[PDB]
């Protein structure tokens, strides 16, 4: 699953913040993903 940010959500980096993603298929329980994000530490960072 990959999320690409547009110019709205891209505007400044997530820091000291909780990000929640939820995937809700048409049958069965949704998957809810939550991370508190510290300052990102590389070009890619492991947040959760």
């Amino acid at each position: 699953v990959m999320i690409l940010f547009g110019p709205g959500e891209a505007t400044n980096v997530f820091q000291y913040e909780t990000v929640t993603i939820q995937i809700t298929p048409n049958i069965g329980s949704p998957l809810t993903i939550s991370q508190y994000i510290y300052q990102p530490d590389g070009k890619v960072t492991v947040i959760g």
Partner: protein, 49 residues
Amino acid sequence: SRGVSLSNIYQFSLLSVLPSQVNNKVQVKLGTSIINLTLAFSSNSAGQT
């Protein structure tokens, strides 16, 4: 030991207070001169103050 017991002493927080509410709002008269104090320091990272 001395029988002092206070169940709640917590009254105030500066976490509620923006820098603009305290900076330049207390001042010292050194003779003729009057100096505005800066009390809340601040810095920026990732667009947060």
